[PDB]
Amino acid sequence: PHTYIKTPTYREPVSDYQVLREKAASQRRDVERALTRFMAKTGETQSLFKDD
């Protein structure tokens, strides 16, 4: 085959509903955590504990 046979090949597609739900959920949770920590650090802040 190597002498004259060519087939294109693609990357492995992840079409799984479980891991797609997990990826979208974790990315949404991480971006909202990053956003709220950035907005609490660059403004007036409150805390339940002391100097927390």
């Binding site: 909202e32 956003l35 709220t36 907005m39 339940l48 504990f49």
Partner: protein, 188 residues
């Protein structure tokens, strides 16, 4: 639903609520209500319904031994300026705090807010909530049963609420709930 799951914490020797004794269950709840309240500060909902629910849940966590019993957050949300819904949720939390912690200065804060607030519906609602969840009843011996409080509430019935006809009936209801139909007992 997150606020309904909160059971009273197992404080040992009145240990100060600090990070070490934070329940592993309540840390997830507290992270979620912090995320929800902060996201409401940037993308607000309808009726600030999530602000009202998160203030109610923080008061639930404070009613058990999880968050320190501090009314400063609710006092900042009750400052003339948060949704009238935010305002009445925060004032409900302050009324519950001054019932449980027997706070004198919070009761004077609430009575001052009854006397001079711009919105009269909020004044009527503060008198209503302080009637429904009173800081003391007539049967209770409390530290807040001075002659000074009897004189303040009699001055609030007599003068002070003379301009509304609904604040005066609310002050009559509050005096009835606190001191009853006879002479205030805690008096010379």
């Amino acid at each position: 639903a997150l606020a309904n799951s909160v059971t009273p914490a197992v404080s040992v020797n009145n240990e100060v609520r600090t990070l070490d004794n934070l329940n592993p269950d309540v840390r997830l709840i507290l992270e979620e209500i912090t995320r929800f309240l902060n996201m409401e500060k940037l993308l607000p909902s309808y009726r600030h319904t999530i602000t009202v629910s998160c203030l109610r849940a923080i008061r639930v966590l404070q009613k058990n031994g999880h968050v320190p019993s501090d009314p400063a957050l609710f006092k900042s949300y009750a400052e003339y300026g948060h949704f009238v819904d935010i305002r009445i949720a925060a004032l409900e939390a302050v009324v519950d705090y001054t019932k449980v912690d027997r706070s004198y200065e919070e009761l004077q804060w609430l009575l001052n807010m009854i006397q001079n607030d711009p919105v009269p519906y909020v004044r009527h609602k503060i008198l209503n909530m302080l009637t429904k969840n009173p800081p003391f009843t007539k049967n209770m011996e409390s530290p807040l049963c001075n002659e000074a409080l009897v004189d303040q509430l009699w001055k609030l019935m007599n003068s002070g609420t003379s301009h509304d006809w609904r604040l005066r009936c609310g002050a009559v209801d509050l005096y009835f709930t606190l001191f009853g139909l006879s002479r205030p007992s805690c008096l010379p």
